[PDB]
Amino acid sequence: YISRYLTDFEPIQCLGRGGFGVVFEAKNKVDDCNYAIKRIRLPNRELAREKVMREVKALAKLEHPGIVRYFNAWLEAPPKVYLYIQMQLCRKENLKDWMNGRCTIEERERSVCLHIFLQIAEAVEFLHSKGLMHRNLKPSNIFFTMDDVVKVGDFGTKLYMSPEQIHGNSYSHKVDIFSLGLILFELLYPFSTQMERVRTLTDVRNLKFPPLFTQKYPCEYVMVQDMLSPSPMERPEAINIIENAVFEDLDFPGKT
Ligand X SMILES: COc1cc2nccc(Oc3ccc(NC(=O)c4c(-c5ccncc5)n(C)n(-c5ccccc5)c4=O)nc3)c2cc1OC
Q: Which residues bind ligand X (CB under 6 A)?
A: 15-16, 23, 36, 38, 52, 55-56, 58-59, 67-68, 85, 87, 89-90, 92, 134, 143, 152-155
**Of 123, 158, 162, nearest in space to 142 by CA:** 123
Query: By C-beta, is 124 or 223 nearer to ligand X?
Result: 124
Give least dist CB 121 to ligand X, A: 14
Query: By C-beta, is 155 or 213 nearer to ligand X?
Result: 155
Query: By C-beta, is 83 or 228 nearer to ligand X?
Result: 83
Helix (H) or strand (E) holding 176: helix 174-188
Give least dist CB 143 to ligand X, A: 6
Give least dist CB 182 to ligand X, A: 18
DSSP3 helix / strand / coil % (the chain, rounded to 5): 45, 20, 40
- CA dist., res. 27 & res. 35, Å (int): 6
Task: Return the SS3 of 73.
Answer: strand
Query: By C-beta, is 39 or 108 nearer to ligand X?
Result: 39
Virtual torsion, Cα 69, 72, 78, 81, nearest 10 deg = 70
Give least dist CB 37 to ligand X, A: 9
Give least dist CB 90 to ligand X, A: 4
Query: By C-beta, is 59 or 159 nearer to ligand X?
Result: 59
Give least dist CB 66 to ligand X, A: 9
Rg value, the chain, Cα: 19
Query: By C-beta, is 15 or 250 nearer to ligand X?
Result: 15
- CA dist., res. 156 & res. 254, Å (int): 33
User: Do 115 and 98 form a contact (C-beta atoms < 8 A)?
Assistant: no
User: Do 38 and 9 form a contact (C-beta atoms < 8 A)?
Assistant: no
Residue nearest to ligand X (CB): 153
